[PDB]
Every structure is written in C-alpha cells, then in structure tokens.
PDB file of C-alpha atoms and ligand atoms in Angstrom:
ATOM      1  CA  UNK A   1       9.558   2.404   7.769  1.00 16.96           C
ATOM      2  CA  UNK A   2       8.914   6.008   6.823  1.00 20.60           C
ATOM      3  CA  UNK A   3      11.683   7.838   8.721  1.00 16.43           C
ATOM      4  CA  UNK A   4      14.949   8.431   6.905  1.00 17.28           C
ATOM      5  CA  UNK A   5      18.412   8.069   8.312  1.00 20.36           C
ATOM      6  CA  UNK A   6      21.282   7.576   7.682  1.00 17.29           C
ATOM      7  CA  UNK A   7      22.484   5.569  10.620  1.00 14.54           C
TER       8      UNK A   7
ATOM      9  CA  UNK B   1      24.511   2.215   3.214  1.00 12.27           C
ATOM     10  CA  UNK B   2      21.180   2.389   6.514  1.00 12.76           C
ATOM     11  CA  UNK B   3      17.722   3.545   7.517  1.00 11.94           C
ATOM     12  CA  UNK B   4      14.362   3.611   5.785  1.00 12.86           C
TER      13      UNK B   4
ATOM     14  CA  UNK C   1      24.626  18.929   5.072  1.00 12.35           C
ATOM     15  CA  UNK C   2      25.712  15.293   4.758  1.00 12.34           C
ATOM     16  CA  UNK C   3      23.332  13.635   7.261  1.00  7.62           C
ATOM     17  CA  UNK C   4      19.822  12.812   6.120  1.00  9.34           C
ATOM     18  CA  UNK C   5      16.575  13.451   7.908  1.00  7.75           C
ATOM     19  CA  UNK C   6      13.659  13.813   7.488  1.00  7.85           C
ATOM     20  CA  UNK C   7      12.676  16.228  10.151  1.00  6.19           C
TER      21      UNK C   7
ATOM     22  CA  UNK D   1      14.497  18.203  -2.937  1.00  5.64           C
ATOM     23  CA  UNK D   2      15.327  20.124   0.198  1.00  2.32           C
ATOM     24  CA  UNK D   3      13.527  19.128   5.843  1.00  2.00           C
ATOM     25  CA  UNK D   4      16.991  17.565   5.907  1.00  2.00           C
ATOM     26  CA  UNK D   5      20.100  17.180   3.791  1.00  2.00           C
TER      27      UNK D   5
HETATM   28  C1  DVC E 101      24.020   8.472   5.436  1.00  2.00           C
HETATM   29  C2  DVC E 101      24.846   9.741   5.578  1.00  2.00           C
HETATM   30  C3  DVC E 101      25.838   9.670   6.720  1.00  2.00           C
HETATM   31  C4  DVC E 101      25.173   9.872   8.086  1.00  2.00           C
HETATM   32  N1  DVC E 101      26.829  10.789   6.543  1.00  2.00           N
HETATM   33  C5  DVC E 101      26.615   8.359   6.677  1.00  2.00           C
HETATM   34  O1  DVC E 101      27.405   8.406   5.461  1.00  2.00           O
HETATM   35  O2  DVC E 101      27.510   8.226   7.737  1.00  2.00           O
HETATM   36  C6  DVC E 101      25.626   7.138   6.645  1.00  2.00           C
HETATM   37  C7  DVC E 101      26.385   5.828   6.434  1.00  2.00           C
HETATM   38  O3  DVC E 101      24.785   7.282   5.492  1.00  2.00           O
HETATM   39  C1  DVC E 102      10.670  12.721   5.650  1.00  2.00           C
HETATM   40  C2  DVC E 102       9.806  11.551   6.023  1.00  2.00           C
HETATM   41  C3  DVC E 102       8.941  11.798   7.264  1.00  2.00           C
HETATM   42  C4  DVC E 102       9.698  11.689   8.574  1.00  2.00           C
HETATM   43  N1  DVC E 102       7.881  10.742   7.297  1.00  2.00           N
HETATM   44  C5  DVC E 102       8.224  13.134   7.096  1.00  2.00           C
HETATM   45  O1  DVC E 102       7.351  13.045   6.003  1.00  2.00           O
HETATM   46  O2  DVC E 102       7.465  13.421   8.243  1.00  2.00           O
HETATM   47  C6  DVC E 102       9.268  14.251   6.860  1.00  2.00           C
HETATM   48  C7  DVC E 102       8.653  15.624   6.668  1.00  2.00           C
HETATM   49  O3  DVC E 102       9.983  13.944   5.645  1.00  2.00           O
END
C-alpha cells in the first residue's frame, strides 16, 4: 500500500 | 478499522 | 483532526 | 508524529 486512510 |  | 492522511 | 491527523 503506502497511502494511509482511514476509509 | 481500514486503509494501508 | 480525527481523519488520517497522509497528505 | 504530526501531514495528517
Ligand atoms: C479512521 C478514522 C476515521 C475516518 N474517523 C474513521 O474512524 O471513520 C475510520 C473508520 O478510521
Ligand atoms: C504518509 C504516507 C505517504 C502518502 N506515502 C507519504 O509519505 O507521501 C506522506 C507524506 O505520508
């Protein structure tokens, strides 16, 4: 991944 | 709890 | 805050 | 930490 969030 |  | 990221 | 939060 590498992005973050939170969804 | 989502993501990553 | 309260959301996440990362930007 | 803290580019978001
Ligand atoms: C990450 C933070 C958030 C966006 N406030 C959430 O609690 O809704 C999500 C489930 O996790
Ligand atoms: C959080 C993770 C990321 C999106 N890969 C980033 O490194 O670009 C950002 C600055 O921090």
